[PDB]
Design an enzyme around this catalytic site. Structure first.
Site, short mmCIF file in Angstrom:
data_model
loop_
_atom_site.label_atom_id
_atom_site.label_comp_id
_atom_site.label_asym_id
_atom_site.label_seq_id
_atom_site.Cartn_x
_atom_site.Cartn_y
_atom_site.Cartn_z
N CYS B 85 5.09 10.55 -16.27
CA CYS B 85 4.01 10.45 -15.30
C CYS B 85 3.59 11.82 -14.79
O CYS B 85 2.40 12.10 -14.65
CB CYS B 85 4.45 9.56 -14.13
SG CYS B 85 3.09 8.99 -13.08
N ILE B 86 4.56 12.69 -14.52
CA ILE B 86 4.29 14.06 -14.10
C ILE B 86 4.77 15.08 -15.12
O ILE B 86 4.67 16.29 -14.86
CB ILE B 86 4.90 14.36 -12.72
CG1 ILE B 86 6.43 14.23 -12.77
CG2 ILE B 86 4.32 13.43 -11.67
CD1 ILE B 86 7.13 14.83 -11.58
#
EC number: 2.3.2.26
Lengths: 31, 111
Positions: B85-86
């Site tokens: 996600c990051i």
């Protein structure tokens, strides 16, 4: 040897736009 | 493909193991040597495990997150993980080297 930077950034406002020059013509740009 | 210099140009570093700076600098050097020491398939697997993308984007702009590396406390029996996600690579602090490359290769082998 061949020490090179390992971080995202090496300078903030130094060298202006000289670092954006092509590798072939980097000899023609200073700072 | 994915280039080592390109990867270095926009990769940051974190610290959760609390290691000293003198050891940490050489650890970063070891990690960069490891990254520069595989073949095309292995680096493609690495970038897949890191950012869920087989190819690194050509420009810094477009990265919704900023890829980073988090040094977890040492655990020689724990494979490193990642948050897609990051795009944050959580890797333990491997004081030993051979175990470090072995675990990295094992982690990137899984698809």
């Amino acid at each position: 040897m061949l020490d090179e930077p390992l971080e995202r950034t090496t300078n903030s406002s130094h060298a202006n736009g000289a670092a954006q020059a092509p590798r072939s013509m980097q000899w023609a740009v200073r700072n | 493909e994915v280039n080592v210099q390109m990867l270095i140009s926009f990769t940051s570093f974190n610290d959760e193991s609390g290691e000293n700076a003198e050891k940490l600098l050489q650890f970063k050097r070891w990690f960069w040597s490891i990254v520069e020491k595989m073949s095309m398939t292995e680096r493609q697997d690495l970038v897949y495990f890191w950012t869920s993308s087989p190819s690194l984007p050509a420009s810094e702009e477009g990265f919704q997150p900023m890829p980073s590396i988090t040094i977890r406390p040492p655990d020689d029996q724990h494979l490193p993980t990642a948050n897609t996600c990051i795009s944050r690579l959580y890797v333990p602090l491997y004081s030993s080297k051979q175990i470090l490359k072995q675990k990295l290769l094992l982690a990137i082998k899984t698809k």
